Design a protein around this ligand. Structure first.
Ligand SMILES: O=C1C[C@@H](C(=O)NCCc2csc3ccccc23)c2ccc(F)cc2N1
Ligand SMILES: O=C1C[C@@H](C(=O)NCCc2csc3ccccc23)c2ccc(F)cc2N1
Ligand code: NA
Ligand code: NA
Ligand code: NA
Lengths: 301, 306
């Protein structure tokens, strides 16, 4: 038993991290087969911060302008192309440590592990959720761009995030591995701001089910609710709407614990009304929204 | 910016995990050089588990009674011996992925990364602190015994924990890699309980420094305190004593943020007496005690390990 914020083991990703240099700019890239993926903004100069013309900047570069280092070894860049906001550098060596992998684009509320990296070298690993406002609440310094987010549900690594930038509120924005930004953000230093963030309701419910599976019962109650009346209350606390999809997804945790979804919804209503009154749930004094239904089942049963 | 609970990258340890089977028991072992380390309780049956004679159980076993699998390969066990509560299985092949490593024993309040494993396969990684009562608040299911805890200091892995059991309250107990238990526990099925725990004061201060570095400053105040006066209040709240060594270790964060340790202690005093009054620190409504001073400096300065 026990319940922890838990990341995937990072070894399969660690063997794919390389350092990418263009001019005076160094950041991280992701070496899979014979391609290195990194943020296209690596090619930008101080001049080009606000309105880079990436097509124009790229055509001006040759292969030998890109220095890629894997450990102590330089790789030879033999091609370059851009896909949306990621740069793809063809290199003359396939990565012998390439794992089984795929690229997936995720939806808000999904969780993943981040391998934070500097100068092509792993620094640490933590867990994040894609926020409803399409930011992530990461831990990233200067040098971290090109760090990736991933899941590993069997032996296949699913890459779902590449890090591009920090917004003024200290939260983070980035792309899928096809270079499409999550949310309305762009890889320019023009003023942009995250929308107001909301709580991931389906994940909170999942975490309440985790608490019950781990023997915590104190917050339950004899009430139920309609889905609509739940949503009307929840929105007033800046909670995302709970949809029928979400109710369906909670079905297995509902059946394992004997507590119907709308019954647990009423428990959440009460917690929002009353707070915790000196108590904790799974060691937390706030409601946790960065565990999905899938996470709870995986870690518990 | 940002501050997260962050584990060490686990790859160097992933390449050392194997599966160990004895009879109907399967659990995890750690393969380094030509030895596989695992909990000695692997040799026990249900009858034995109440009052095991490990010496006696072991002498009855042959090498071929231990099935060790590294991926889909069987290793050949060519020797077996016990050191405290860990079993050492000599095998005929050195682990080609053996990293630079050492065995260290940690002190309560020190943190480490746990690589949770099942059937010799790593499943997850998280950060833990050794509690003052010598338990860890882990997440472990049946199959997890032999999972290990570690730090990385450079390119050197320091192994500091092996998982042996869950106590009735749902917290966890284990040994160093020399087989000595952390805390007053034994590897048998009998009544055992965690002592009452305390809060790791130096780590809370470290986390308050992390908060300030990340722009969270509401709890700061004009006041300072003495080490003695702080310790009288801390003891009253089931906080560990703060020593001069702790003050010294916080010196770097004190100088970087402009907030002396005893000045931050006055913030902590007020929080204990008054609570947080609806507010949060780094998104938490309770004081976090599972980041050391070293952890905060590492994460706020971006140290790496290729
Ligand atoms: O997560 C990070 C990384 C990195 C960053 O935010 N952004 C990368 C730059 C960038 C975005 S659009 C565009 C167009 C041209 C050239 C550069 C860019 C950073 C720097 C300083 C600091 F204090 C914190 C962080 N945090
Ligand atoms: O952390 C865990 C692992 C594992 C566990 O604690 N095994 C302990 C076995 C053991 C300890 S001493 C001794 C002497 C002889 C024979 C067995 C033993 C477990 C099983 C089921 C469950 F629901 C939870 C957990 N939690
Ligand atoms: Na690397
Ligand atoms: Na209810
Ligand atoms: Na003060």
């Amino acid at each position: 038993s026990g319940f922890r914020k838990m990341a995937f083991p990072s070894g399969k990703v660690e063997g794919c991290m390389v350092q990418v240099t263009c001019g005076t700019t160094t950041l991280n890239g992701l070496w899979l087969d014979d391609v290195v993926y990194c943020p296209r903004h690596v090619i930008c100069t101080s001049e080009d911060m606000l309105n880079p013309n990436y097509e124009d900047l790229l055509i001006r570069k040759s292969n030998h302008n890109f220095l890629v280092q894997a450990g102590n070894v330089q790789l030879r860049v033999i091609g370059h192309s851009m896909q949306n906001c990621v740069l793809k550098l063809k290199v003359d060596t396939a990565n012998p440590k390439t794992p089984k992998y795929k690229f997936v684009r995720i939806q808000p509320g999904q969780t993943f592990s981040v391998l934070a990296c500097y100068n092509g070298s792993p620094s640490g690993v933590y867990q994040c959720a894609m926020r409803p406002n399409f930011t992530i609440k990461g831990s990233f310094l200067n040098g971290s761009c090109g760090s990736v987010g991933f899941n590993i549900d069997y032996d296949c690594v699913s890459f779902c995030y590449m890090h591009h930038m920090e917004l003024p509120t200290g939260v983070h924005a980035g792309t899928d591995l096809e270079g499409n930004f999550y949310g309305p953000f762009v890889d320019r230093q023009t003023a942009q701001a995250a929308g107001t963030d909301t709580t991931i309701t389906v994940n909170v419910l999942a975490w309440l089910y985790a608490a019950v599976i781990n023997g915590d019962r104190w917050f339950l109650n004899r009430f139920t609710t309609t889905l609509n009346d739940f949503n009307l209350v929840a929105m007033k606390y800046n909670y995302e709407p709970l949809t029928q999809d979400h109710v369906d997804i909670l079905g297995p945790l509902s059946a394992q614990t004997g507590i119907a979804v709308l019954d647990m919804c009423a428990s959440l209503k009460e917690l929002l009304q009353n707070g915790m009154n000196g108590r904790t749930i799974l060691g937390s004094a706030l409601l946790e929204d960065e565990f999905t239904p899938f996470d709870v089942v995986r870690q518990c049963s």
